[PDB]
Amino acid sequence: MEVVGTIDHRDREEFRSRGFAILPQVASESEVAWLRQAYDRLFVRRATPGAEDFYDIAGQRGPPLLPQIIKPEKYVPELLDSPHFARCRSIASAFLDMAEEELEFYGHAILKPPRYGAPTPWHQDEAYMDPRWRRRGLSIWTTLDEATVESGCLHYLPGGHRGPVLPHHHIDNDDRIRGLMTDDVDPTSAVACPLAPGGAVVHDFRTPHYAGPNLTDQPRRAYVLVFMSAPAEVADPEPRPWMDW
């Protein structure tokens, strides 16, 4: 089918109030079919002579990293001039109350392989950013596959975007590319956001989120679009001693 969902006031209101929103169908099934073909070429599962398969990308070729590609639009420029991109930009504009022309953006691709046992630990995306420069922004996480709690859908801490940027630390201080995590989220307050293919979740830069392991025999592919304002100078920057400069 070629139908796609809409957004209304209620979506925006809940995004502002809770720090995230679910969009059941941000990409049509035909757009999803094309996005899957883009991925099928971006993420090649490759065999070895008698050992384990690996994904033929940077990061995969210590402990395994989540297969990801920053700015996949460099390799597939067809990506960022899709109707799905424009639709997402318009959504970002509505949710951020900023003109589409004011938004800077980039893409990010993720693949959780079958039986991938590592979670994406609790974190806030702003924890990765320079505390000297504040941007308003959000991420639109579009899934190409069914996303369930068992396959690695996102979980959020509702209202956490109006709290502080929580203390983070590197998962491993001698292996910083593994990323950041915080221990300061009460998992009992969390809410999961399962999605059907072509669904998306949207979250503020400051909303804490987590993704479970992929316990299923199927890969779970997400395509993330990040939209943000220009940076503003912060007079009294937070220390963020976990920053990798």
Ligand SMILES: O=C(O)CCC(=O)C(=O)O
């Ligand atoms: O897909 C995941 O496992 C995590 C996604 C995430 O952290 C994000 O989109 O900001």
Ligand code: NI
């Ligand atoms: Ni994140």
